[PDB]
Amino acid sequence: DFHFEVFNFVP
């Protein structure tokens, strides 16, 4: 369960 969205996003 790795989602690139979870670890990369603009705060």
């Epitope: 989602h3 979870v6 990369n8 996003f9």
Partner: antibody
Framework: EEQLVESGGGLVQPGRSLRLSCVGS???????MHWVRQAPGRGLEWVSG????????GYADSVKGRFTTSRDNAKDILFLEMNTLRSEDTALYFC?????????????????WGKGTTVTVSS | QIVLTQSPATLSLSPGERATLSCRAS??????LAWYQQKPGQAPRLLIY???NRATGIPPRFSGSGSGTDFTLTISSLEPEDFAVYYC????????FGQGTKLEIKR
Amino acid sequence: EEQLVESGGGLVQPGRSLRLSCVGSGLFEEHAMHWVRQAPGRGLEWVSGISWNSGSVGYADSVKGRFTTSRDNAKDILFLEMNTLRSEDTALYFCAIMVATTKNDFHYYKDVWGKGTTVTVSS
Amino acid sequence: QIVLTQSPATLSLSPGERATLSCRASQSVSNHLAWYQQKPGQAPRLLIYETSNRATGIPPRFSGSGSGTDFTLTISSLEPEDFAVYYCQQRNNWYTFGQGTKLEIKR
């Protein structure tokens, strides 16, 4: 001007434990944190990564079931609890923020690295 | 996870010349590939993120390109700074670095 500082490294015997901390500046914060290590004269190896809310945690297969990554937003401290230590985990351990995305072609990246703390495992 | 192999292992060039470094993945990493530069005694530093985008302050002479499995980092005419170790990195399935490509001055 945000910075990361690691601590907890040092000399430890094989099969023993050490515990590293990585403190980011100030306050939760909205970025994932990762552990990256480098053995002497070798390349970089991703150790572990934890999402901003500790909802997602991963590890390289080399350390799986031996190390445990956690974090606390309130203190903005990242932890690497190291168990069942081996000589092959002797390395310089970096704490790093590695965020990068181009969603909606909105370019955003944040890449911050600590100077690292040293881990030496030997009898 | 995904394995990244870098070629050349060592690249020997003169300043003013121009470098092409390859990084191939065993399985497709989409466009989530970054390039890092590292010199002795220093933490690594981001050059390119998401295949082709330069971090702030990165000279235009660096450019990234590729898709899925094949990627390349190009240095159009090398400066003395640029001779160091370069790592490709994927963040499609967790994070993985390549074994590194060392860029040496040819004499």
